[PDB]
């Protein structure tokens, strides 16, 4: 059945094909079904990433039942309440299932969980009808609450959250991706963070570039319009490294990139995401949505 | 030494194989007999026999354990019959008025044991608990 062709497709999945070019996201206003207040609460906040196997027998109707079940589990673990909400307009395609939010309110929200999937169809192409595919989870709150919610979900839907990790290659690619994005209001200078590998804690280089200089350098190293290519990313990194070495005769290339921040969003290797501008928000998710699939497959 | 080790390993694996074979055997006879029983198998009269048996035994139990002392009182059987009849004849008003023929101990007995329920405002009326819903 689905298992056989799924075996074949992950057999074909080898590190031999060239990395495909990616289309630069364009300035896109928030969708009509998207509530500005809900995303405004979501944006300008820190989120922890989690990859998820597809939900088993998940229904969007019995949300109150889920809320009361989580409340019962929490009180069993022990003036708080659990609220389930349905959020429209942030699905990449019609194939991607509807997204929803879970909140913990102390009768002041303390813990928020977001389940979503944008442009994620390969998982949806290899799944049966019973399952719901929202492999992207964003957590914001206390770690104990996150662990409790994860335990409940493991017991209920037969799934786990895996802490999604981002390497230097992916982080550099996404850095180039958002520095390709056009921002009308440069409200945050781009900034990169590094960490020298050493058992005792050592120097952590932070390198910041003025947004105008960064955009000019990007357009200088921008060849294919509306698209980003591996050669563009490599030359971007090479130019930064050459500038750093010309300044200080220090090979930054022998250091691990750990955090990249720009005007629109910021990412960290451990799985920290900060979002500022809505105009590219959706596209952001799509990119990181691929990483969940790449962790599932 | 490898030769011995594999000899006892194969002996253990063979014993496990006979264990699994034996277990799946009775698994097979159980599955086959269940399939045959379902094939051979494939209501009103059964329910009627049960209802009549239950009613006769209930009447005997009532006469043996809830007798009248000696106005004209009715038996607890007739009271239960009136309640059951009104419960299904008038599903929108199953209350029956309490007359002098209702022995007050019987009414209180039906009230204590959750069988009869009092009207929220009219004390002279009681209904039967709808156990079917």
């Amino acid at each position: 059945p689905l298992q056989k062709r799924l075996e074949s497709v992950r057999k074909q999945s080898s590190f031999i094909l060239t990395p495909p070019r990616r289309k630069i996201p364009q300035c896109s206003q928030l969708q009509e079904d998207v509530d500005p207040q809900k995303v405004a609460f979501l944006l300008h906040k820190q989120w922890t990433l989690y990859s998820l196997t597809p939900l088993y027998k998940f229904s969007y109707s019995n949300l109150k039942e889920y809320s009361r079940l989580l409340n019962a589990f929490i009180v069993a673990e022990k003036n708080i309440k659990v609220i389930f909400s349905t959020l429209l307009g942030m699905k990449g395609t019609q194939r991607d299932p509807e997204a929803f939010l879970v909140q913990i309110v102390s009768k002041k929200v303390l813990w928020t969980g977001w389940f979503c999937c944008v442009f994620g169809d390969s998982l949806l192409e290899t799944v049966s009808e019973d399952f719901t595919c929202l492999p992207l989870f964003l957590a914001n709150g206390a770690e104990s609450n996150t662990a409790i919610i994860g335990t409940w979900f493991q017991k209920t839907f037969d799934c786990y959250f895996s802490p999604l990790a981002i390497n230097a290659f992916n982080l550099s690619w996404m850095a180039a991706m958002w520095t390709a994005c056009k921002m009308d209001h440069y409200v945050a200078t781009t900034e990169f963070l590094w960490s020298v590998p050493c058992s005792p804690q050592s120097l952590d280089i932070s390198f910041a570039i003025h947004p105008e200089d960064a955009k000019a350098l990007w357009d200088s190293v921008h060849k294919t319009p509306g698209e980003v290519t591996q050669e563009e990313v490599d030359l971007f990194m090479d130019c930064l490294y050459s500038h750093f070495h010309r300044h200080f005769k220090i090979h930054l290339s022998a250091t691990r990139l750990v955090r990249v921040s720009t005007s629109v969003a910021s990412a960290h290797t451990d799985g920290k995401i900060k979002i500022l501008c809505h105009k590219y928000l959706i596209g952001v998710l799509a990119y990181l949505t691929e990483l969940a699939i790449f962790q599932i497959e | 030494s490898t030769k011995e080790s594999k000899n006892e390993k194969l002996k253990e694996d063979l014993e496990r194989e006979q264990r699994w074979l034996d277990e799946q055997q009775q698994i097979m006879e159980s599955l086959n007999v269940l399939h045959s029983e379902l094939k051979n198998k494939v209501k009103m009269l059964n329910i009627k026999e049960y209802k009549e048996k239950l009613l006769s035994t209930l009447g005997e139990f009532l006469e043996d354990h809830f007798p009248l002392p000696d106005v004209n009182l009715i038996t607890l059987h007739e009271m239960l019959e009136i309640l059951i009849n009104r419960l299904f004849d008038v599903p929108h008003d199953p209350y029956v008025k309490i007359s002098d023929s209702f022995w007050p101990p019987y009414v209180e007995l039906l009230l204590r044991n959750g069988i009869a329920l009092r009207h929220p405002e009219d004390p002279t009326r009681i209904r039967l608990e709808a156990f079917h819903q």
Binding site: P1, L2, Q3, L6, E7, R10, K11, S14, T53, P54, Y56, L69, A72, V75, A76, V127, S128, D130, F131, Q154, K155, T156, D158, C159, Y160, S162, I296 | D13, R16, W20, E23, Q24, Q26, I27, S30, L31, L34, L38, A130, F131, H132, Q133
Partner: protein
């Protein structure tokens, strides 16, 4: 009599006259009972007597309490005793603390009652005790274990909802209500801890019997379909195989062979994906956390389950594909090499680029014992593939590849016979394709191994070569260039045989102890040699 039967009779006689020395007598009898109960347990009959004596109005509250606290079975508990106990509870002349203790005992001794159907018939009497708020938690804990799908009636759901509204969302009420929702979701919209559930009767022998009653890496199992918790015996599975329900998590299926029996034939698509993602992510998290004994034990359990079902898993296959290039060869070598044995049949054109390349990478550079190890793994794979099939180009290419590895390593190790033994054993396992699986395909071992082994210096090598050519001849006569090479080899060994240096040992013994000396060799234990020289060469059929 016997020491205990005297006490049982004394308690059957009921309370006696005014106490002159009767307190001491009652104490002696009660002490004898509890001593027997706490040493090895009580029989069903004695329990049937004493439980109903305690739940009756006879004797005071202390005597009944001690009797209840010493109602520990040595084997099982009769359900008729429990029925009579429920009747005694219905009588009403029982103490409230005694009722609480009896419900606690019924919950604690639930898995020691021989049958529970007649007890489930008393579900109405059990449910009507929810009105009492002193028995409510214990009655809820009992109903949580006793409830089947047939017991979830609309009236009971309504009354339980009203009781929840009266008392609030109590933990026991919420557990019972969640069970009712699981059994009947349509009536609601229109492994759980209970307080005071400490096992007061937990002796050591009762503990060993409770652990014998069970025939986190593994998730804790959470439940007219048969409830999964009630599945505790093989006859129960035999009776209820048709009406089984899939668990919320099937990890407990691994260490519970009862559900494995239904898994073997369920052939359900969704559970396949559910177990695939489960085991794959479990393998990923265990591997990342390792960098060990618990991981080894978990993989051993996986291998044991893999021995059953007579077919390989795919999560393990994907994990091994991902980790083989990164594999050092010594992290969990014992665990890895047993998974390659159970690999699904596939054409020998996609596995080699992804799987066998790193296998050869390790093989050409790792220890000779590791070479014998991977040889055993591949011969087990060949056995499994032939068993499953019972196409031919794939196995032919696999045999050619393993033979190339064989000859290369045979050169590599300065012609060490330790690997030669595994080579020859593998080839014996190969040599029976036509007669074991009805497959008209015979592959011939390379001449390098032929000449290295045939004229080798070890006698057991000569033995197993005689055996292997005898089997090859038997297979050939059972059903072009293959026959020519076989005849050339036969001429080669008949020229080499009737001397051989490997037999000089025997000759020295022949000097220590007769024109015909082959009989002494035969008595030394060369029975394969008789088989080869009597039924294969046919040049001198007579001994």
């Amino acid at each position: 009599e016997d020491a205990l039967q005297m006490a049982v009779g004394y308690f059957e006689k009921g309370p006696i006259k005014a106490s002159q020395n009767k307190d001491k007598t009652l104490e002696k009898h009660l002490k004898t009972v509890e001593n027997v109960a706490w040493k090895n347990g009580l029989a069903s009959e004695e329990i049937d007597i004493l439980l109903n004596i305690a739940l009756s109005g006879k004797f005071g509250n202390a005597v009944n309490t001690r009797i209840l606290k010493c109602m520990i079975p040595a084997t099982v508990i009769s359900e008729d005793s429990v029925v009579k106990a429920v009747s005694w509870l219905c009588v009403g002349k029982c103490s409230g603390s005694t009722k609480v203790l009896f419900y606690r005992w019924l919950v604690a001794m639930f898995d020691f009652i021989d049958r529970k159907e007649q007890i489930n018939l008393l579900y109405g009497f059990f449910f009507a005790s929810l009105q009492d708020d002193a028995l409510c938690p214990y009655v809820c804990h009992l109903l949580y274990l006793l409830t089947k799908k047939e017991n979830v009636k609309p009236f009971r759901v309504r009354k339980l909802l009203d009781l929840q509204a009266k008392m609030g969302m109590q933990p026991h009420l919420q557990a019972l209500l969640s069970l009712y929702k699981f059994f009947a979701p349509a009536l609601i919209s229109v492994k759980i801890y209970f307080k005071n559930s400490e096992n007061l009767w937990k002796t050591a022998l009762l503990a060993v019997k409770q652990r014998n009653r069970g025939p986190s890496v593994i998730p804790v199992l959470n439940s007219g379909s048969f409830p999964l918790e009630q599945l505790q015996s093989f006859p129960q599975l035999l009776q209820n195989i048709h009406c089984l329900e899939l668990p919320s998590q099937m990890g407990s299926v691994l260490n519970n062979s009862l559900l494995l029996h239904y898994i073997n034939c369920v052939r359900d698509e969704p559970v396949l994906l559910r177990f695939y993602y489960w085991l794959s992510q479990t393998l990923q998290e265990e591997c990342i956390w390792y960098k060990g004994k618990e991981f080894t034990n978990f993989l051993d359990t996986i291998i044991r389950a893999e021995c059953f079902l007579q077919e390989g898993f795919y999560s393990c296959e994907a994990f091994l594909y991902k980790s083989l290039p990164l594999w050092d060869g010594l992290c969990c070598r014992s665990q890895f090499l047993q998974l390659v044995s159970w690999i699904p049949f596939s054409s020998f054109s996609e596995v080699k680029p992804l799987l066998f390349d790193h296998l050869a990478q390790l093989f050409f550079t790792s220890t000779i014992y590791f070479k014998c190890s991977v040889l055993q793994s591949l011969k087990e794979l060949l056995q499994n593939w032939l068993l499953w099939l019972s196409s031919m180009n794939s196995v032919s290419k696999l045999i050619h590849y393993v033979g190339w590895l064989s000859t290369t390593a045979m050169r590599l190790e300065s012609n060490n016979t330790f690997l030669l033994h595994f080579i020859l054993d593998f080839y014996e396992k190969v040599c029976d394709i036509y007669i074991n699986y009805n497959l008209p395909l015979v592959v011939l071992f390379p001449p390098g191994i032929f000449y290295s082994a045939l004229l080798s210096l070890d006698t057991s090598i000569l033995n197993q070569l005689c055996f292997i050519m005898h089997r090859y001849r038997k297979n050939l006569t059972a059903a072009s260039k293959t026959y020519q090479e076989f005849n050339h080899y036969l001429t080669s060994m008949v020229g080499c045989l009737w001397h051989h240096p490997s037999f000089l040992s025997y000759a020295v013994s022949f000097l220590l102890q007769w024109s015909w000396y082959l009989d002494y060799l035969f008595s030394q234990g060369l029975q394969g040699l008789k088989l080869f020289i009597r039924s294969s060469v046919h040049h001198s059929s007579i001994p």
